[PDB]
Design a protein around this ligand. Structure first.
Ligand SMILES: N[C@@H](CCC(=O)N[C@@H](CS)C(=O)NCC(=O)O)C(=O)O
Ligand SMILES: N[C@@H](CCC(=O)N[C@@H](CS)C(=O)NCC(=O)O)C(=O)O
Ligand SMILES: [Cl-]
Ligand SMILES: [Cl-]
Lengths: 208, 208
C-alpha cells in the first residue's frame, strides 16, 4: 500500500484539487490531505514539497514520487491504479478518452473570464457575484454551446459511464448555476445531477 | 491509411499547432495542413469544422473524427499510432510520462505574462519586444527555476530520449532566448539544441 498525500489550498476551494480528490475517492484509494495557505504565500516558500514542482496545488505524493497538475495526476492514477482492480476514471474507448482529455485541457486553458468573475468562492464558499461582464458573457456562451454539443446524446454523463471529465465540466457549469445565473435548463440539470456525486459531496463538506 | 488534416492559424504562429505538427512529423504520419484566419474571426463562424469543437486551433481530423486541444491530440496520436510500429512521443516509463504530462499541462495553464509579453511573433515572426514587466520577470524566474530542476540530470532531453515535452518546453524558453533576453546559459543551450529538431525546423519554414 503506497502512502498517498494530496496537497490542497487551505480553503479547499481549488477546482483542480477537487479533481484529484474526486479521482482518489472514486478509486477508493486511501490518502492523507494536507494544506498550503496560498493567500499567505506558503506556496512561494521552499518549506513545502511543491515549491520544487510547479509551486501550485494540487500536488500528489505517492511514496517518494511527487507530481503536480491535476490532469497529469488523474492520468497517472488511472495508469498506476488500473482497471479492473481499481475503478477506471477515463473512458476505455480511444475516441471518448481523447474527448475526455480535450474537455479537461480546454477547461484548464480557456474561459478565464468565468474563472475570474465566477471563482470557486461561489461554488464552495457561498459567495455571490455581480452580473457578468461582456467578456464573461462571451465565455458563458461558449461554455453553453460546447457543453450542449457534448451532451446532445441525451445521456446523464459525457461518455456513458461517469468519468473525471464530468466532475470538471460540472464544476465549471456550477460557477454559473450556483451564482443564480441564467443557464440553459438541460445544462443546469446536468450540473446539478453531477454535483450530487458522492466524491464531490465529500469534497464540498471539507470547506463547510 | 487514415486521412489526417491539421488545422493551423493562418500565420503558423500557434505553439499548440506546432506541438501537433511536430508529433505528426516525428511519427512520419502523412497529413494535409489547412488554415483559419483567427485575426479575421474565421474561427468564430460556423463554416469551419472547429466551430463545433472548442473554436480554437489546433484541430486534428482523422477521417470522421475531429479533436481539439494539442495535448489531447498528441496523446491520441501516441495511442492510435502506437509504438513499436510508429515512434513514441511520450516516455514509456510511468513516472517520466506523468512528468511529461505535468510539463505540458503546466505550460498551457501558467506563465501568462511570458505568453503575452513574449508572444510567438517573437519565436516565428522575428518580432522584438520591450523589457519584461515585473509580472513577466516573475514568470520568467519560475520558468527558469522549474526548467533547471527538470534538467538537473545533465542530459540533452527531459526524459532521456526526446519527447513531445521537449518541443513545448523549448518553445517556451525560446520566447525569451529569441528575444535577446538574459537566460541562464544551460537553459539557452537546451532551448537552442532542441530548436534544431528537424520537425520543429520544418514548422519554422512554414511562416518564412
Ligand atoms: N492546470 C492546473 C492549475 C493549478 C492552479 O492554478 N492552482 C492554483 C490554485 S487553484 C495555484 O496553486 N495558484 C498559485 C500560484 O499560481 O502561485 C491544474 O490543473 O492543477
Ligand atoms: N490549450 C490549447 C490552447 C489552444 C489555443 O489557445 N489556441 C489559440 C491560438 S494559439 C486560439 O485558437 N485562439 C482563438 C480563440 O481563443 O478564440 C491547446 O493546447 O490546443
Ligand atoms: Cl489558500
Ligand atoms: Cl490567424
Amino acid at each position: 500500500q503506497p502512502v498517498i498525500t494530496l496537497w490542497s489550498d487551505a480553503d479547499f476551494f481549488s477546482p483542480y484539487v477537487m479533481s484529484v480528490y474526486v479521482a482518489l475517492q472514486e478509486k477508493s484509494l486511501p490518502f492523507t490531505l494536507k494544506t498550503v495557505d496560498l493567500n499567505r504565500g506558503e506556496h512561494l516558500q521552499a518549506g513545502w514539497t511543491g515549491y520544487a514542482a510547479t509551486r501550485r496545488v494540487p500536488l500528489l505524493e505517492v511514496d517518494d514520487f511527487a507530481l503536480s497538475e491535476s490532469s497529469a495526476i488523474t492520468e497517472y492514477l488511472d495508469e498506476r491504479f488500473a482497471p479492473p482492480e481499481w475503478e477506471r476514471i477515463y473512458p476505455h474507448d480511444l475516441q471518448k478518452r481523447a474527448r475526455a482529455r480535450q474537455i479537461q485541457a480546454w477547461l484548464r486553458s480557456d474561459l478565464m473570464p468565468i474563472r475570474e468573475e465566477r471563482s470557486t468562492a461561489v461554488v464552495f464558499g457561498g459567495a455571490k457575484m455581480p452580473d457578468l461582464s461582456e467578456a464573461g458573457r462571451q465565455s458563458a456562451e461558449k461554455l453553453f454551446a460546447t457543453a450542449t454539443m457534448l451532451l446532445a446524446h441525451g445521456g446523464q454523463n459525457l461518455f456513458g459511464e461517469w468519468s473525471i471529465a464530468d466532475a470538471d465540466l460540472a464544476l465549471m457549469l456550477n460557477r454559473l448555476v450556483l451564482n443564480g445565473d441564467k443557464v440553459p435548463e438541460a445544462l443546469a440539470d446536468y450540473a446539478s445531477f453531477q454535483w450530487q456525486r458522492a466524491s464531490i459531496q465529500r469534497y464540498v463538506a471539507l470547506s463547510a
